[PDB]
Each structure stands twice: as C-alpha cells, then as structure tokens.
Amino acid sequence: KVFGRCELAAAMKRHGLDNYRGYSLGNWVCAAKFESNFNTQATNRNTDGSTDYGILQINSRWWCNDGRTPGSRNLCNIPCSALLSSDITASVNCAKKIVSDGNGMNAWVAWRNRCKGTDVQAWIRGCRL
C-alpha cells in the first residue's frame, strides 16, 4: 500500500508514534518519506547482506526474521514479511523498539541525513489531526 502523506500521519498518530521518545509526528512522516516513499511494500538490500522492510525500512540484521541474514537477530519477534502489510501496526510496534535502542532516530541514517534539524512540521501541514 502506498499511503498518502496525511493518511500516513493519521495512521502513525493513531498507533501512538506522535511524540514517541520525544519525536514529533513530522519526524516520523519525514523518515517514512525518504525510507520508503510511503510504500509499505518497499524492500531494499543493505551492503552487509541484510534487508530493510516496510514504511520505515526495518533492518533484518537485528529486528525481524527473513531467514537469509546470517548472524542477524529478530528483536521485534516477527517475520520481516509482516512489516510489508497494508496495516502498519507491526512496523510501528517495531519502530518503537528501534527508537528506544539508545541513539533515538539516528538509527535511521536517512532521518539523520535528511530530516534531522529541518522543519519536519511541514510534513503534517494541512492534515486533520
């Protein structure tokens, strides 16, 4: 499913991501834009052989199981495929664990490089929240 900007903001807010770990909703929408272009089916291979899945490109190296990432972990306890569903519940629950790992949203390189410090509030402009 390819979410609309405000449609994704609404979904994330409903699932409690707004202000989670102190990160405003726009930060999460921005991260999703550059990680997956709002497409829940997005998958991308990483240099180390792991793969990222879903709207927030969760890495199989530590968070989900895809059965092809040697020595990886499955800290969110779910198959990576479950992070590709039209319902973002699993991705949000897992993202909540990732952002609590210690480095906050820096866990998402794209967020650090393209969202961090910018006017992320623009990402939720015009939305009814």
Asked whether the beta carbons of 23 and 16 are under 8 A apart, the reply is no
Please state the φ and ψ torsions of residue 88, each to the nearest 5 degrees. Answer: -80, 5
Shortest distance in whole angstroms from residue 119 CB to Ho ion: 20
Comparing CB distances to Ho ion, the nearer of 46 and 118 is 46
104 touches Cl ion (CB under 5 A) = yes
> Which does residue 52 bind out of Cl ion, Ho ion, none, counting CB within 5 to 8 angstroms by kind?
Ho ion
52 touches Ho ion (CB under 5 A) = yes
Q: Is 87 annotated as a binding residue?
A: no
Contacts of 117 (CB under 8 A, 6+ apart): none
The window from 48-56, 75-83, 101-109, 110-118 that contacts Cl ion (CB under 5 A) reads 101-109
Shortest distance in whole angstroms from residue 90 CB to Ho ion: 18
29 residue type, one letter: V
Contacts of 38 (CB under 8 A, 6+ apart): 2, 3, 4, 5, 8, 32, 55
Binding stretches for Ho ion (CB under 5 A)? 46, 52, 101, 129
